[PDB]
Amino acid sequence: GVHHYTIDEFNYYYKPDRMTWHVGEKVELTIDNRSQSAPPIAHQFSIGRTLVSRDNGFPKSQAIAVGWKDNFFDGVPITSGGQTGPVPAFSVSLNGGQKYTFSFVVPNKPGKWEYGCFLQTGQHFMNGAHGILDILPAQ
């Protein structure tokens, strides 16, 4: 059976901020931008590994996040409404009040991955917009 997961986006955090999948699990994931501000803001959902931050040669208290080195969804065939196939550099960007639902089979990419939002030059990320995705071997 397909396992339904929802990730809600708020300013500036995911609910839930942890998720666990098994390799080979059939997942339907809904990403919902529930931005609570007036006006609501856009949010991004990207799963990857190895944070990349801005550099200018000067030390920082908090590094400004810019992206992931490795995208979890690389090569992963996705179905969303009438469309099926892998998506190059997959990520989900939503305006306030918009959601996106897609399904896939969890690839053989075991271990810890992270999800994050890199919008507004890393400000969402610095404010809490990051989660942890654990991928367990097939049960």
Contact characters 16-55, Cu ion, x per CB under 5 A = ---------------------------x------------
Query: Which residues between 71 and 130 bind Cu ion (CB under 5 A)?
Result: 117, 119, 124, 129
| Minimum distance, C-beta of residue 89 to Cu ion, in the bound complex (Å) | 17
Buried-state track 62-83, b at ≥16 Cβ within 10 A, e below 16? eeebebbeebbbeebebeeeee
Dist. CA 37–CA 85, nearest whole Å: 35
Whichever of 33 and 71 has its CB closer to Cu ion, that residue is: 33
Written as six digits, the tokens of 95 are 């305006």
Residues touching Cu ion, count (CB under 5 A): 5
Could you say which DSSP state residue 74 is in? T
Q: Which of 12, 17, 14, 65 is nearest to 37 (CA)?
A: 12
Q: Which is nearer to Cu ion, 129 or 135 (CB)?
A: 129
Task: In angstroms, give the least distance from the CB of 68 to Cu ion.
Answer: 15
Number of C-beta neighbours around residue 51 at 10 A:
17
Nearer to Cu ion, 15 or 26 (CB): 15
- Least distance to Cu ion from the beta carbon of 61, Å? 21
- What does the binding site for Cu ion look like in residue numbers (CB under 5 A)? 43, 117, 119, 124, 129
